[PDB]
Symmetry: D3
Subunit: 253 residues, 6 copies
């Protein structure tokens, strides 16, 4: 049972900054373990190609393809115009994957190339377990008792999947007006007014600095998330001068 | 001197969730006492009618009622006010009621306020009754806000003439912000209605311009609405919410959707 | 309803330091009110004699006094007790008085207690009067301690017969730990004297062995003595310490050095 | 996933009080899940015999039991251990069991530990079972204490030969303090017994002197016993305490009074 | 070393309220010292003319003044600047002055800044001078905001040419955000003016777009304005506000109401 | 104005752990600055001889000799039997140096050789500024208003010297019974009983983990303190098997 050197990201003690050399030398298991309780790992100054990226993430478990024969492993998020996920707009709060064979345990994001962007296109991370514990009861009640449905632009998405150590969160926040949308949420028995108001209020609570981390990208950055322990978002970068190229990997057990 | 089981509502330890059986079996004095320090009580799944509701609340003191020459108040409800979201009404209407304490505008002492949900339909995230821990808020408030509350003169004018008849004063009258009862400084304050919400009353601050008064209420409002001090009650059939009117202030949030059914019964007591 | 300037004593906001001019100019009601929520008041550099001391405290309510058939209590002090560190005495002696509330053992209601330092000499770090914020302590206390206080039967027996005469009961008698006044649960508790300190009274807990009772009081004691709840007043000439007897409990620490001069005047009021 | 209603035990939010009816109606998986994050569950007012106790705990996984070859372990209890304060025994005796995790000394994995109060008499403030939130404590621990736990080699020797027979290793053997399970670093540690308490086991730290090890454990113990991390359970008939043995460590405090009746049932499960 | 009596302004312990008599009797060095750790001092009820104001502030070090060659700076004030809300001016105008430190744009070192209220009329909730505890804020700041402050190049351009004449550099020039003095990282930063407010200066960040810079300042401003770091001073006649310009940054909020009289004296000193 | 990478030692944010390479590469001024607000610096794995130790510390200002001609620079604290300061017993809470020309601004301690000790002979550091701010008023009153005198085994030692950014503390706690003592404190107008009780109570408050750091020594450890910002203590190591050899340097401006 080995230890890796890290520093917490949040004041709560959540998250982990790891030096690139310490990360590279650590056993896969050591990082996989730390991620479960720290939620996310931030590594800077990591000069690697796409093949090394795959060598790194594939060791964490079975690759989740984005039938499959193992080829759709690394997703290139390069801000392609006319796309949503691989596009240039917002991705509101969500977790990756779904249930059963489509579940995702770990998500890896690596910055291949970043140019002309300093305060847009952040990837954000929310400590949902701590947030749900400290949340006003009227917000937590909705998450725990009401049926959340989603339509791809209706099916039930169970908000909480109790794994004991965490309640894995699956949720899909609405896109901001003006943003190209791939999904639309609703809450059974709530009006449009009520659902809009709920997501606005919940979104504001989840974005408080105690729970919320904003990662602004630099070449060689690696962001790893335990997809069961955090939820995440991409902020818009809709300027054509911006170059933002990330590689995405996903693993599960 | 007896004890009732309860769970705190607020992270601070303020408020009281009480199981309906525990509430019903408790002596009136036990609940009346707890309210002084806990500010408010929340009971769910209480199955009672209006007569039993009165039996419960009347035991807490002298019923605050408007009869004889005062029969005009609240359109002649006498004791138990029916808040049923009626069109063309404000207090008993479908819009917001901003932060207030009961009784003040009618120059009546109100110690306890009781709200029971007779019927709630097609509303999940509107029409909340909200509760503020003002003692703790005043203790932790930025000095420039507390100063205004402690030192400046607040005046109110009523606007819903059908509700207040001639029991309320005619024009602008002074409402003392704090009344020192020792164990608490009872707060009597009357916030401005949001733009677009029909206004039952209207506040001003002497020596302040309209620009300053608006800015002050909005800033104070945002402070008081922080989760540390602020509880939002979303109504279900059989909910009972009791407030110590000296220890908390409260609001109703708008429910201006025609499909909503929201009928509450309201009782008031004082000593 | 009027305001007195003060600074909190405790980091929690509890307690009140009041400048002597501000205290003297304030109405009795202003101070009486503040005590209910602040628990205690500290005034320094007050230059008064015993007659003026009585003029001040008697305004707070009905003087708790022992005359006629009760003239035996406290060796015939009647109203203002002189605590002057007399040999062969306990309450008015030179040793510890463990955590207690006033009045309880004599079956008298005491709301406010006043202590004025007439003369203090050759003491800088002994002979403190200490004050505990019991409401906050009970709120934050470990459950296994609070349970005992709320559920078990506490009994006391007096030992200083010359002080309590026949006004106190003869043997062991029940003292209710909490009396619910709503705004506070008034605490009546009587801690055991430390080994080596002459004992004016003695507690027991029904159903507990001597081993368990000793362990409980020591553990509770250490909890109550934490800085968050606990204020230590080291006396200087002209100090006035006022306590709301329903809102705090207090102790005196030993001053068993013959060179020490420690003379306090004590008044008590109730409604 | 189903939700069981509970209230936190610790101010931090750790631990779970669950109503006996809510507990009985809950799916095993619901409680088993909750235990991983809450560390321990406290249920009062259960009325169950030894067979029903077994039916409840056995559903949580594979029963940790010692039969056939390992029949000597625990003086032949097999599955449910009866801790009844037997004279001349230690684990099932009347003395202290210092901070520990179950199973480790027998080289058995134990995930959940169950303790039910069959009979308790003449004890109110002794014989407690205590629980430590070790994950929070390690996170907030002074660095000089955590360093020892993370970097030094901890060895243990089994002393109560009748309890551990030949299943436990002979002489000193290394027990790893932390085992990283990702969601938690499982703690395996075996504190030294107080002087005067019969010792079932004995710890040492390689490279440390006897006084360094004694000093370390004394200081670490005091830190872990702070109320932020520490819960004391005083037993009553029908109490059920469940612990996730990976998430908390626990102790028994002595009850060496002849009049005390203290009989607990113990079950253990693992996956 | 002498001690001046004071009360903290912020809940954190930062800032100092000092009684006017205590202030006047205090040695200059005592106040000068206290300011380094308390950031700012607030004195009320001073009755002083402009000459006495100068005598007080000039004792704190070398007067930061602009005479002879630099006589054009501040429209020829020399030592004491009169901020009297003059139309067609900005610094001495009636609008907002956003978060800043004094001196930096003129390339002058300023250690202490003094502000005295000569005359204030018809203003109760506008025209505040505000103070930010930047050391605490930077320590608790979200990492994405602090990174910009520590790593990016901040440039400023002077716009109110009449105020800064030829002493300020022409066009865009780099201003270092942090200057490490050991005891503090002195902050030099110049926030953008709100739209509708006449701008005395203008910031940019090298490599940032206009909307990135605007977005950064909006978010940073909101964080710094949290009551934990932020004090709002609403002026009355005889108020004195002193700031250590190395330890805090400050702003003026608009007072663009014609009826408002707001005349402040300003002094600056450095070593 | 340059920055050095560090991690806080205390949960309050006080103190600084610095990696040995980062420390060696940092400018003297950068460390000297950080020490003023962080109180103390901890560096591990520093393999240097006595001459390099001197090269390092002498750059911080004027060397304070332990008349002088500059030769008594590095004090060797090697646990010599029959000595106090360079002995094997306790040194209770104190700051180094005195006033005027004998003042000490920075104290450096380096572990040349450490053997047979794991839980004795710690050097401890107290955040006195934070402690004085949060202290019960009855404790702070004594420190602020009463005269403290010391006798070498009577002269006034001013408790607080107000430097603005800090109140520099000079104080000399009594030695524990059984420990060889080089000084003895008293408080004017307090009895022996009262003074003993005060130091006991104050000592307990100052040793709470919020304010108090314990450094257990390893070969190559360097502990630097800003002597104006912290007070410190040595815990006994009175076992003859223990090897504890520290080099001490002191600088002032
Ligand atoms: O108590 C009342 O009946 C009325 C309704 C609005 C509330 C506030 C006040 O004075 N009253
Ligand atoms: O109030 C009293 O006179 C007495 C003295 C001790 C105190 C506690 C109590 O019942 N009394
Ligand atoms: O799990 C067990 O049966 C035994 C009893 C003592 C406890 C600690 C340990 O290894 N065991
Ligand atoms: O210090 C000054 O006189 C000028 C006025 C505005 C303030 C900010 C700055 O560089 N100055
Ligand atoms: O582009 C990013 O920052 C993350 C994209 C993402 O969340 C996803 O691919 O699911
Ligand atoms: O309808 C409600 O929520 C409460 C209305 C109210 O506050 C009142 O009756 O004064
Ligand atoms: O002497 C004192 O400090 C107070 C004595 C006391 O508590 C009492 O009079 O009951
Ligand atoms: O008796 C108890 O309180 C629990 C004993 C125990 O921990 C064990 O049997 O291992
Ligand atoms: O008018 C004020 O409030 C202060 C103005 C100011 O900061 C300045 O003159 O630089
Ligand atoms: O030996 C140590 O740990 C420090 C000694 C010390 O404090 C000193 O020399 O002044
Ligand atoms: Fe995603
Ligand atoms: Fe109301
Ligand atoms: Fe008393
Ligand atoms: Fe056990
Ligand atoms: Fe300025
Ligand atoms: Fe030293």
């Amino acid at each position: 049972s080995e230890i890796v050197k890290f520093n917490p990201v949040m004041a709560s003690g959540f998250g982990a900054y790891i030096d690139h050399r310490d990360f590279l030398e650590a056993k896969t298991e050591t990082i996989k373990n730390l991620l479960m309780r720290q939620g996310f790992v931030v590594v800077k100054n990591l000069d690697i190609d796409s093949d090394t990226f795959r060598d790194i993430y594939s060791a964490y478990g079975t690759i989740v393809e984005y039938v499959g024969f193992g080829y759709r492993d690394t997703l290139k998020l390069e801000g392609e115009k006319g796309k949503i996920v691989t596009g240039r707009g917002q991705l509101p709060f969500h977790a990756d994957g779904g249930l059963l064979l489509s579940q995702v345990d770990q998500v890896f994001l690596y910055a291949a190339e970043i140019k002309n962007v300093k305060f847009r296109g952040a990837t954000t991370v929310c400590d949902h377990a701590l947030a749900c514990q400290e949340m006003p009861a009227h917000l937590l009640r909705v998450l725990e008792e009401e049926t959340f449905e989603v339509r791809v632009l209706w099916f039930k998405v169970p908000v909480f999947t109790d794994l004991g150590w965490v309640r894995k969160m699956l949720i899909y926040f609405p896109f901001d007006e003006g943003q190209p949308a791939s999904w639309e949420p609703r809450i059974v028995g709530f009006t449009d007014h009520e659902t809009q108001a709920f997501f606005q209020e919940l979104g504001a609570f989840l974005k408080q600095p105690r729970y919320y981390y904003k990662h602004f990208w630099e070449d060689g950055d690696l962001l790893i998330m335990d997809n069961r322990r955090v939820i995440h978002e991409r902020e818009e970068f809709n300027d054509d001068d911006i170059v933002r190229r990330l590689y995405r990997g996903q693993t599960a057990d």
